[PDB]
């Protein structure tokens, strides 16, 4: 059921957690979020406080240009913010992509 | 990892899929969504078109009064809407609860 439950989260919230892992720094998630404009990023949780890291090296120049025009500039660099701001962070990305 | 990935979806999107099941009608999900105001409901998928069914019989009178004051009235009855409206439906519930 885990695979269809993730499908629901994708249709309901336009977000997909590809996988998780825990390194020395903390617990990390590979995440994509969409609307067709899509953004890929990692969220780290260190113990809590949240680290956001955009995954942009693979994206094409046309792709980067579209995202940059509409998304807030800080979304294209690493960012640290409190856990209590995580849902707003999700909504800001969602509102910017759509 | 499935349990911590669901925890992330909860913190990121303020929603939790308790479980799924498939009956004769289709595929169903028990879902809670929150901000502290919380709403419990089932989403059915019939093949697609979406059926929303609020789960209110257990809630107390004080709880129902708070939700009713702020949430749209149609969220307290069964509702059917196209799959392409599912993310807006999520966002409307999210915006109304917060």
């Amino acid at each position: 059921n885990s695979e269809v439950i993730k499908d629901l989260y994708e249709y309901l919230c336009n977000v997909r957690v590809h996988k998780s892992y825990e390194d020395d720094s903390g617990l990390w998630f590979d995440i994509s979020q969409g609307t067709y404009s899509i953004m890929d990023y990692k969220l780290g949780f260190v113990k809590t406080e949240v680290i956001y890291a955009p995954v942009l090296k693979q994206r094409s120049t046309e792709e980067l240009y579209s995202l940059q025009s509409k998304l807030p500039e800080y979304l294209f660099e690493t960012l640290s913010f409190p856990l209590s701001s995580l849902n707003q962070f999700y909504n800001k990305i969602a509102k910017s992509l759509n | 990892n499935s349990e911590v990935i669901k925890d992330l979806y909860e913190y990121l999107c303020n929603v939790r899929v308790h479980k799924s099941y498939e009956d004769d009608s289709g595929l169903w999900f028990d879902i809670s969504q929150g901000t502290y105001s919380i709403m419990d409901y089932k989403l059915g998928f019939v093949k697609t078109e979406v059926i929303y069914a609020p789960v209110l019989k257990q809630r107390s009178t004080e709880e129902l009064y708070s939700l009713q004051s702020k949430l749209p009235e149609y969220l307290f009855e069964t509702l059917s809407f196209p799959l392409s409206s599912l993310n807006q439906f999520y966002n409307k519930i999210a915006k109304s609860l917060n």
Binding site: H18, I38, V55 | K47
Partner: peptide, 26 residues
């Protein structure tokens, strides 16, 4: 059993997992 169309049939975001191939934590 016969094939049955999935309820969620559109191409998902599962394809994008490959975007994280060579990336490390910051």
């Amino acid at each position: 059993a016969e094939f049955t169309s999935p309820y969620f049939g559109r191409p998902s975001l599962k394809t994008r997992a490959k975007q994280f191939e060579g990336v490390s934590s910051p």
